[PDB]
Amino acid sequence: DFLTEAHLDLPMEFESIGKAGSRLGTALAMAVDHEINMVSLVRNLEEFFARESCGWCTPCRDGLPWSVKILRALERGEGQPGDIETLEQLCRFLGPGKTFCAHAPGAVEPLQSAIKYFREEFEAGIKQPFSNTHLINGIQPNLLK
Amino acid sequence: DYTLTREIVTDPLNVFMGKLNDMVNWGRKNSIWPYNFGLSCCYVEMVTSFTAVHDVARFGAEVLRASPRQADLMVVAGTCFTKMAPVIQRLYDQMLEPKWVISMGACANSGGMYDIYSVVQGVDKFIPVDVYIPGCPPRPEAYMQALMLLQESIGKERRPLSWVVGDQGVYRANMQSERERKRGERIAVTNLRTPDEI
Ligand code: SF4
Ligand code: SF4
């Protein structure tokens, strides 16, 4: 998980980083400067994680590419309402115990942390209204409220 | 091509006897008195055709006799229930010659949606039918169209002018099917109005 400048004064231990909402991991930290867009960074991370899926189990294999496509749409301002809620649901449903191995919980850790800490950058990519359908001539659509 | 009721035969038709047969057929087809017999919802559409917005009287077929003896046409407008089938057969037998039958609606045609223990599957299982009308119910103008089809069928049939002289057999024309007649215009249809409008 991503951490902010306020978490820099934390000892690099498993217990201390664990209660900050992240993991100690390999303890080889990566710094992100202000010139890096968080949506593009998480898109790069999720592209890596989705293409490195072993393909055994459904949530990682078929839900990481969905997050990749959502982040790609958010990158060029083609996001639609419900995309961030979809990303949050993907983070919740790809956590530990839901997938076969721990590849996908690690995949969704930076996505959920970046949404938690930098939600204004993910909201900035939502420009178009939601459209999943096209009109079919002769059939009046069911306009849900 | 004709069918004989006393077989598939040819046209039996002097030139004065042909004119008399045409006059009798014209008078019969322009004066068709239906029997007031109501089985089910199809009869509601039939009597709707009798009202002001359709005016089946214009064809001279509004008299609507309560006695089978005064009626020329039995419209089986409704389901042939098993309890009602002897009643229908008795009322048809009480009608006098010439008599014609229009089966109206899917129930009278075949039993319709009621393939069920208490329903005879079509009135043609026990009485002969001159004109069939699909629909559930057929709209009143469909009943009028079947009336006109019956008029065309009557206008070219051959019946004895008298019961004391001549051939007594009833010859009915083997008319071309309406499906085959209308197939040319029906298949050529390309576009219809979309169902999103009035
Ligand atoms: S979570 Fe692990 S087991 Fe499941 S498809 Fe991804 S890499 Fe394979
Ligand atoms: S064909 Fe349909 S409308 Fe006519 S009697 Fe049967 S159920 Fe009623």
From TrEMBL, chain A:
Keyword line: 4Fe-4S, Flavoprotein, FMN, Iron, Iron-sulfur, Metal-binding, NAD, Oxidoreductase, Quinone, Translocase
Molecular function per GO: 4 iron, 4 sulfur cluster binding; FMN binding; metal ion binding; NAD binding; NADH dehydrogenase (ubiquinone) activity; oxidoreductase activity; quinone binding
Residue span, NADH-ubiquinone oxidoreductase 51kDa subunit iron-sulphur binding domain: 39-84
Family statement: Belongs to the complex I 51 kDa subunit family.
Annotated function: NDH-1 shuttles electrons from NADH, via FMN and iron-sulfur (Fe-S) centers, to quinones in the respiratory chain.
Subunit structure: Composed of 13 different subunits. Subunits NuoCD, E, F, and G constitute the peripheral sector of the complex.
Protein name per Swiss-Prot or TrEMBL: NADH-quinone oxidoreductase subunit F
Species lineage: Bacteria, Pseudomonadati, Pseudomonadota, Gammaproteobacteria, Enterobacterales
Part of the whole protein covered: 298 to 442 of 445
